[PDB]
């Protein structure tokens, strides 16, 4: 029986021994999986909150782990007020560890208590505490509550700004503190203020870790709050062509990959032109391969029709088609094939044979080595020539002939 098993693991949490008590606490998610009944999940969560209120910090951490593992079941408790109140009663503990665990509880419960103002005030007060674990837990709770509540976000944006430009805050806690601005995707003026703060923040703290974290949270804000995307793309391209560090360029590359995977239609022709110009004058194959991966992701979408003779993208694809790196060759062949099968202009008749012979050269390079990385480029090339044969029928004879000669 459900209630019989509930009593069976309920008798263990007055055992006095901490081991059987943590036993009793951590058996709860299995009970929630077996018996998803709201009147029973309610009673289980209320007594979990009671043993959270009276237990030590390890029991509180066990309750926190249970709450994290049972996030989909805590929307069906419906005695929210007294449960949250008896958890919240030990925000007033003088123990900073207990305060940190309660902040992690509030952040874990932020899906079912948005606009709960005493929780917001506790997070705001604990963000200025002198204990590192409490401040980290307050940052975690603020990140959770900013995602679930816009009234929390509008004031906490100003607070996080003022404690980022506050130099008493150390650099590592600043690094943990930047991605709160990712959840500013509630209001247009809120996202604009967050973008202004991030623009001042990148040039104010030009550290490599700072620019990685700030650019990634700026692009997560731009992807979530959709009216930020062209300026974010042009900012990423500017930081890809100007910032000399390889890590910053690598984040710019993977970030433009994310933005091309999400919203390829919002790329302008100038953005593709700037990315191509970045791929021309780079000396590193590790960055050129990533840039060509972004351009090959863009090539399989409608961004080519927005981009469109022989342009910088075509010249770049021809140059990267004949490259000693197999990945760069595969990406250039993919761009050439997508351009060839995308439209039927007069200019692509010349590069059709270029795509065919680049495919054949990639086949003769990727077949005799049996490397694990060679098979991926071989699969890319063979998929590209399948697409070339299907999209344009007449030249399939040469593709079949070179496959037979390579076999």
């Amino acid at each position: 029986d459900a209630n019989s098993a509930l009593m069976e693991l309920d008798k263990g949490l007055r055992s006095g021994k901490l081991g059987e008590q943590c036993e009793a606490v951590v058996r709860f998610p299995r009970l929630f999986q077996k018996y998803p009944f709201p009147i029973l999940i309610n009673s289980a969560f209320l007594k979990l909150a009671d043993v959270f209120r009276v237990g030590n910090n390890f029991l509180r951490l066990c309750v926190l782990k249970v709450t994290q593992q049972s996030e989909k079941h805590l929307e069906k408790i419906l005695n929210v007020d007294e449960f949250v109140k008896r958890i919240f009663s030990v925000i007033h503990s003088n123990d900073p560890v207990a305060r940190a665990i309660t902040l992690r509880m509030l952040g874990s419960l932020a899906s079912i208590i948005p606009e709960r103002k005493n929780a917001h005030h506790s997070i705001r007060q604990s963000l200025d505490s002198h204990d590192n674990v409490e401040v980290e837990a307050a940052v975690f709770a603020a990140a959770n509550f900013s995602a679930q509540s816009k009234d929390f976000a509008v004031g906490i944006c100003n607070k996080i700004s003022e404690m980022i430009q506050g130099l008493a805050t150390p650099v590592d806690l600043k690094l943990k503190l930047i991605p709160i601005l990712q959840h500013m995707h509630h209001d247009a003026i809120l996202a604009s203020s967050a973008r202004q703060l991030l623009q001042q923040l990148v040039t104010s703290y030009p550290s490599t870790k700072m620019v990685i974290v700030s650019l990634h949270t700026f692009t997560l804000l731009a992807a979530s709050s959709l009216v930020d995307t062209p300026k974010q793309i042009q900012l990423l391209l500017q930081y890809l062509k100007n910032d000399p560090r390889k890590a910053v360029k690598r984040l710019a590359i993977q970030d433009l990959k994310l933005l091309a995977n999400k919203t390829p239609h919002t790329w302008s022709r100038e953005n593709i032109q700037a990315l191509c110009e970045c791929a021309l004058q780079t000396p590193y194959d590790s960055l050129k391969l990533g840039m060509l991966s972004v351009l090959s992701t863009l090539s399989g979408t409608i961004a080519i029709k927005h981009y469109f003779r022989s342009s910088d993208l075509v010249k770049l694809a021809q140059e990267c088609c004949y490259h000693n790196n197999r990945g760069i060759a595969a990406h250039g062949v993919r761009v050439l094939t997508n351009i060839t099968v995308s439209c039927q202009e007069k200019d692509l008749l010349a590069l059709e044979q270029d795509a065919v012979f680049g495919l054949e050269s990639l086949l003769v390079l990727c077949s005799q080595d049996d490397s694990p990385g060679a098979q991926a480029t071989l699969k890319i090339a063979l998929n590209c020539m399948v697409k070339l044969a299907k999209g344009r029928p007449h030249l399939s004879q040469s593709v079949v002939e070179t496959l037979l000669t390579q076999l």
Binding site: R86, S93, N94
Partner: peptide, 13 residues
């Protein structure tokens, strides 16, 4: 209780 300040708000069940 050692975990709470004397001036901390009381808990009323």
């Amino acid at each position: 209780s050692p975990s709470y300040s004397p001036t901390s708000p009381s808990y009323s069940p």
